[PDB]
Amino acid sequence: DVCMDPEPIVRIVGRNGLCVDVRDGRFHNGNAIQLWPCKSNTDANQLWTLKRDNTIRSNGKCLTTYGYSPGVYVMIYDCNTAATDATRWQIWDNGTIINPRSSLVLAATSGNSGTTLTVQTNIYAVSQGWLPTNNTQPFVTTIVGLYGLCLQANSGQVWIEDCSSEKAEQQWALYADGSIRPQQNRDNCLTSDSNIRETVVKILSCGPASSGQRWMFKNDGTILNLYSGLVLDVRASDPSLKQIILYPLHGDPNQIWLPLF
Amino acid sequence: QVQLVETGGGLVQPGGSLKLSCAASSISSPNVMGWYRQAPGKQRELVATMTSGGNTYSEDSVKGRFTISRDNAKNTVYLQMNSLKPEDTAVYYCNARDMWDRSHEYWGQGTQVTV
Amino acid sequence: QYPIINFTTAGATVQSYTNFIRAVRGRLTTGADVRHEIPVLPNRVGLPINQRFILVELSNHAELSVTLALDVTNAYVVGYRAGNSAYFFHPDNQEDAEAITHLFTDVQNRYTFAFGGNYDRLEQLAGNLRENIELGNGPLEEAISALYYYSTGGTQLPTLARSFIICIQMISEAARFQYIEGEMRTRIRYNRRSAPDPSVITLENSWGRLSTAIQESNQGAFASPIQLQRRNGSKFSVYDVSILIPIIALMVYRCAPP
Ligand SMILES: *[C@@H]1O[C@H](CO)[C@@H](O[C@@H]2O[C@H](CO)[C@@H](O[C@@H]3O[C@H](CO)[C@@H](O)[C@H](O)[C@@H]3O)[C@H](O)[C@H]2NC(C)=O)[C@H](O)[C@H]1NC(C)=O
Ligand SMILES: *[C@@H]1O[C@H](CO)[C@@H](O[C@@H]2O[C@H](CO)[C@@H](O)[C@H](O)[C@H]2NC(C)=O)[C@H](O)[C@H]1NC(C)=O
Ligand SMILES: *[C@@H]1O[C@H](CO)[C@@H](O)[C@H](O[C@@H]2O[C@@H](C)[C@@H](O)[C@@H](O)[C@@H]2O)[C@H]1NC(C)=O
Ligand SMILES: [Cl-]
Ligand SMILES: [Cl-]
Ligand SMILES: [Cl-]
Ligand SMILES: [Cl-]
Ligand SMILES: [Cl-]
Ligand SMILES: [Cl-]
Ligand SMILES: [Cl-]
Ligand SMILES: [Cl-]
Ligand SMILES: [Zn+2]
Ligand SMILES: [Zn+2]
Ligand SMILES: [Zn+2]
Ligand SMILES: [Zn+2]
Ligand SMILES: [Zn+2]
């Protein structure tokens, strides 16, 4: 057959690992969609059916964009009385939830609980990365690379070094928003300062939830900064420079990694 | 096992030009071959190295001024250098390492560029 | 005949194994069908007999050689030639039984085992589970000779099954899972011998069902979760394509896309 595709009921996690939430669980038309700490209960307002017809539904109503301009908010609304083009979203494999008529993406321009969701111009930013799951906590992996060495954080600095099975400094949290976080300061994010070659990648505050803080583990084993289209690179195949950078893709072993859990 | 012989160390005033050469004795297939440099008192620093497949990493301070070519035929790397600053004064080491085994890394023993 | 990809354990390096597993992958599927960033093996329906299999020739530094046939539609070993004698796993099905006769044409004579090449049967003939059969360039070397001498009568049955369990994971399962390829690569890196951890067992147990869940997935999210294991025994579920993209490299074709 053609692949049936099903209608999974699922949470949607995003910025700083919080959930897509109908505010206060009031399903009146026009009420806002917010970021809220992911619950562990049955409450329908963080549970979303991904319908065959490209609608995302909670309790019966449709996730709906208030409009088609950047910055306008997203509401729960009756699926039949709403504008059909405002109820349709594509969930992408690189983590972005886009509204086709608008070409704008479900966004969380702030990281605090209660933040109102918006649609913004897509810049593959951490504020715009989502994932549908009932798995509330992030994926904690070591990240093995060149010469079988491990990605390691030490305060702001990050480099690869010999893999020690203890070392918490080598544990990483892959967040639903596409950020890669040091296990010991989940407030902080694997970060590129610039969209240019040989940008040295650091650990900084996730505060900005920026394009340079979003990553995707790809099928060829690279790790891609979506906005820049560059990938993680052990600079010059030299661990001892203690510098992981951004570099156009060529696929040699200094750009291949693997999430070993 | 592999050995690297260097050339082109020189004696220059600000604004001159110096080219450095390096020959090698084959190395595993995806590799790099380039140049490092160390002025006394300070630590060793990459300046430019090229991949097995023609891509290069170089240091910000030196881009534009410095050109790095290879030919792979039998293991050559060249470093071309203009707008010479008294800051480009160090011993320059030619380097070759592959990308499969950490061990397989090889150095010359430097040429003193004085500028 | 069919494409043949060559591997050797004599001076086998991290490069040599890595390039081997790619070559096998690039010969299993054309890379034409890809679902949510993961390549799909060919569909058996519509695939002609002449492009049904590929062969991998394995040799030692004892210079023994042995040729294994993989079924391109599931990347799994169906049998092996050794000099002038071929041996085949019990085909679960008659049309498989006919595709089988199209391989190793010239062999002095064929043999079909009574048992299939699936882990449950294969472990009980070896008398030990996957959890306890070490893998690595060493074990593969031993396994290659054990397959060669079965023709001679020097390899006892539990050792032949044990050798099969080694080759299937270090060839087929590694070709399916970059994850599993990396676990083998780690062993070649430090020249260690090591039985697979629970994470590796589980992926190989889950391959068929992961192939189904990704291909029937709506927009990446699964209808039902799939349970996996960390390198400790501890458990955790996957609901979505996204973490699998770096972990699975080939899928068995299960349906057509829209
Ligand atoms: C993630 O967790 C949520 C909450 O546990 C799961 O939602 C539940 O999903 C099941 C499966 O569809 C629902 O049960 C079904 O209900 C329908 C109602 O007509 C019917 O076909 C059966 O009675 C069936 O049992 C259940 O209602 C639903 N709970 C809520 C509150 O919506 C969800 O399935 C999980 N996601 C995945 C991918 O496993
Ligand atoms: C995000 O993923 C989507 C698909 O899941 C990508 O959009 C696709 O881009 C390529 C380029 O042609 C094709 O697969 C399709 O044409 C696009 N599909 C669409 C637009 O629905 C998108 O490019 C990905 N983003 C990045 C930065 O890679
Ligand atoms: C394994 O060993 C045999 C003997 O050398 C090789 O021919 C195989 O090469 C492959 O088959 C030939 C016909 C040719 O098309 C070549 O390009 C192939 O790669 C070698 N297998 C591999 C994958 O190298
Ligand atoms: Cl009311
Ligand atoms: Cl729902
Ligand atoms: Cl508008
Ligand atoms: Cl490794
Ligand atoms: Cl922000
Ligand atoms: Cl440097
Ligand atoms: Cl039968
Ligand atoms: Cl069969
Ligand atoms: Zn109200
Ligand atoms: Zn080093
Ligand atoms: Zn080497
Ligand atoms: Zn040897
Ligand atoms: Zn078992």
Side-chain angles (χ1 to χ4, degrees), chain A residues 1-6 8 50 54 90-91 93 131-135 139 147-148 216-219 260-261, chain C residues 36-37 39 178-179 189-190 215-216 218-219 222-223 229-231 236-237 239-240 245-248 255-256:
Chain A
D1 264 22
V2 84
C3 288
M4 44 64 73
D5 77 321
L50 316 175
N54 284 113
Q90 285 174 25
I91 295 156
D93 295 309
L131 158 68
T133 190
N134 311 321
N135 211 341
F139 197 65
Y147 310 139
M216 181 178 191
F217 286 83
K218 298 220 84 136
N219 174 272
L260 288 183
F261 48 82
Chain C
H36 297 320
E37 301 234 302
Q178 317 93 310
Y179 184 93
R189 186 153 256 122
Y190 310 119
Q215 278 157 80
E216 300 183 338
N218 194 328
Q219 264 174 142
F222 290 170
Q229 267 179 327
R230 301 191 185 96
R231 264 166 158 235
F236 73 93
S237 307
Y239 294 86
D240 199 75
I245 295 178
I247 297 207
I248 300 165
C255 34

Side-chain angles (χ1 to χ4, degrees), chain A residues 133-213:
Chain A
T133 190
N134 311 321
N135 211 341
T136 297
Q137 243 166 14
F139 197 65
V140 180
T141 204
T142 89
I143 306 183
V144 187
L146 187 66
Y147 310 139
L149 296 190
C150 272
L151 204 89
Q152 199 176 274
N154 293 102
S155 300
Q157 256 194 327
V158 47
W159 62 68
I160 45 94
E161 196 174 334
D162 302 295
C163 294
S164 202
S165 207
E166 50 257 75
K167 256 201 201 82
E169 5 280 322
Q170 314 183 1
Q171 301 268 67
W172 300 82
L174 320 191
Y175 267 60
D177 63 13
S179 68
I180 310 197
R181 281 165 200 235
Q183 175 87 321
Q184 294 151 336
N185 192 27
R186 297 220 223 228
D187 288 345
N188 276 21
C189 278
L190 184 63
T191 313
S192 47
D193 64 31
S194 197
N195 64 342
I196 193 41
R197 317 239 322 250
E198 310 200 62
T199 290
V200 169
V201 169
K202 329 160 163 219
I203 308 299
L204 292 164
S205 180
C206 316
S210 83
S211 304
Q213 296 172 318

